């Protein structure tokens, strides 16, 4: 638990411009965000799942946030009204933001992206498979077996068993 010995990062290191978009603006345009920003998301989630340290790969988290900000600024430069209409139809379509309720504006958004950036929208389940990456960060350590030099010693299988000296050593026996 957090004491004075633990080295938390300073608040000036944590002062990063954040992706402050709503749920409809994150659900819409996600399939073009993931393909454009697959190099940093996989490395950051590998950092989060392998080390399980919140203080580690903070630069990777900053890279993910900056890459998402760069993609949304690129969308803001060219295709703004189409993305706004797509997010509006996605939020007003149903309770949960489901893509199947209106496909009419999704085609216009993909047409705008195909005409401007020449990007192809991926399939429906491209981002839910297993991702294989060539991470530059080395894996930390193999789980070594704990050494117990003084355990409870049993009788070994190779130990010879001569007959007992004067047998059972009971009363009147042997």
């Amino acid at each position: 638990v957090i004491t004075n010995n633990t080295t938390l990062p300073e608040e000036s290191e944590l002062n990063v411009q954040e992706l402050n978009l709503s749920s409809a603006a994150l659900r819409a345009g996600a399939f073009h965000l993931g393909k454009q920003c697959e190099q940093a998301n996989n490395e950051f989630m590998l950092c989060r799942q392998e080390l399980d340290d919140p203080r580690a790969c903070l630069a990777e988290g900053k890279a993910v946030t900056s890459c998402a900000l760069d993609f949304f600024r690129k969308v803001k430069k060219t295709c703004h009204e189409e993305f706004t209409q797509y997010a509006t139809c996605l939020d007003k379509s149903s309770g949960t933001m489901a893509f199947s309720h209106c496909r009419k504006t999704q085609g216009v958004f993909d047409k705008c992206i195909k005409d401007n950036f020449d990007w192809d929208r991926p399939s429906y389940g491209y981002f839910s498979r297993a991702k294989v990456i060539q991470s530059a960060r080395e894996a930390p350590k193999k789980e070594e077996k704990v050494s117990y030099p003084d355990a409870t010693p049993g009788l070994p299988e190779d130990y010879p068993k001569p007959p007992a000296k004067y047998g059972s050593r009971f009363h009147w026996l042997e």
Partner: peptide, 8 residues
């Protein structure tokens, strides 16, 4: 929407 994003 996209108007929240500052210009950079």
């Amino acid at each position: 929407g996209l108007e929240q994003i500052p210009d950079e």
